[PDB]
Amino acid sequence: SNTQTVLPFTGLNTPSGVAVDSAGTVYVTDHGNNRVVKLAAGSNTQTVLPFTGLNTPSGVAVDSAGTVYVTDHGNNRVVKLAAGSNTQTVLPFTGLNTPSGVAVDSAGTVYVTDHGNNRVVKLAAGSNTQTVLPFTGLNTPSGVAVDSAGTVYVTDHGNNRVVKLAAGSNTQTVLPFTGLNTPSGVAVDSAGTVYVTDHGNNRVVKLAAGSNTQTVLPFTGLNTPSGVAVDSAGTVYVTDHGNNRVVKLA
Numbered sequence: 001s002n003t004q005t006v007l008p009f010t011g012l013n014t015p016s017g018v019a020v021d022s023a024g025t026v027y028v029t030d031h032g033n034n035r036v037v038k039l040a041a042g043s044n045t046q047t048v049l050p051f052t053g054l055n056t057p058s059g060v061a062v063d064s065a066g067t068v069y070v071t072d073h074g075n076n077r078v079v080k081l082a083a084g085s086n087t088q089t090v091l092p093f094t095g096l097n098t099p100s101g102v103a104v105d106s107a108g109t110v111y112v113t114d115h116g117n118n119r120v121v122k123l124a125a126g127s128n129t130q131t132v133l134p135f136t137g138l139n140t141p142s143g144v145a146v147d148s149a150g151t152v153y154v155t156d157h158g159n160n161r162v163v164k165l166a167a168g169s170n171t172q173t174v175l176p177f178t179g180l181n182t183p184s185g186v187a188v189d190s191a192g193t194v195y196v197t198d199h200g201n202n203r204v205v206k207l208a209a210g211s212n213t214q215t216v217l218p219f220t221g222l223n224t225p226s227g228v229a230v231d232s233a234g235t236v237y238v239t240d241h242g243n244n245r246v247v248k249l250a
Contacts, residue, residue: 004219004247004248007039007245007246007247007248008046011033012030013032013033014031014032015028015240015241017226017239018060018227019060020230024233024235031058034057036057049068050088051081055073057073058098058099058100059113059143059227061102061104061110066083069102069110071113073099077090077093077096078102096112096121097114097116098115099115100141101113101115101185103152107125108125109125110125111144111146112144113141113143115157118138118140119138120133133152135165138159139157140157140158141157142182143186143197144186148190150167150168151164151165152164153186153188155184155185160181160200161180161183162174163175164194175194175207176207176212177207184198184199185197185226186228188230191208194206195236197226199224203222204216204219218249219247223241223242225241234250235248236249
């Protein structure tokens with residue numbers, strides 16, 4: 001599709017991040033209202049999820065069981081809510097500072113950009129010990145995504161770059177995006193194409209794996225976009241933070 005459409009979230013205030021599940025349900029962190037909202041595909045009526053005591057939530061991820069994970073940025077913590085449950089749990093990360101983003105892999109391992117500590121941490125399901133991943137030379141990571149191969153992708157805000165860390169070898173590669181300015185969010189589709197919100201340049205750009213061609217997607221009029229998500233059909237969703245809206249492109 002060539003035309004962006006605004007999703008009918010109601011009462012949104014500075015959306016900070018977005019995730020989409022395999023049913024096309026769209027989850028958004030409403031940073032300004034301290035809440036997380038979701039909209040089923042084709043619905044006009046959002047649901048406010050029963051998270052509690054959030055403070056400027058910065059990011060959201062959804063696992064294959066429908067469990068929703070939120071970086072509760074102002075409380076230095078990560079919370080999760082199982083599908084159908086009305087009581088969140090706090091994941092046992094320690095020492096986080098203003099965490100910016102979250103991703104979850106097919107094993108349920110949770111990855112968090114610990115933005116205030118310039119590091120990326122991961123916690124396997126059921127574990128008490130978090131692991132600092134061997135990224136190097138980060139400057140304020142702003143978002144994270146993980147693919148089926150366990151490769152972890154991170155937007156490096158201060159260095160205007162996207163990095164990926166291969167599982168096993170721990171080889172870190174800078175993806176050949178160009179002209180980025182404060183990238184804010186990242187998503188990866190099932191084909192390995194990487195999508196990035198180029199916050200400082202008000203655009204969203206995608207790069208297929210191994211390519212030196214980046215594509216500006218035909219969103220229009222963006223202002224400081226904060227997050228991106230891509231569904232199994234290739235539909236792209238963006239939190240257009242500066243315009244208080246969530247836009248999509250099918």
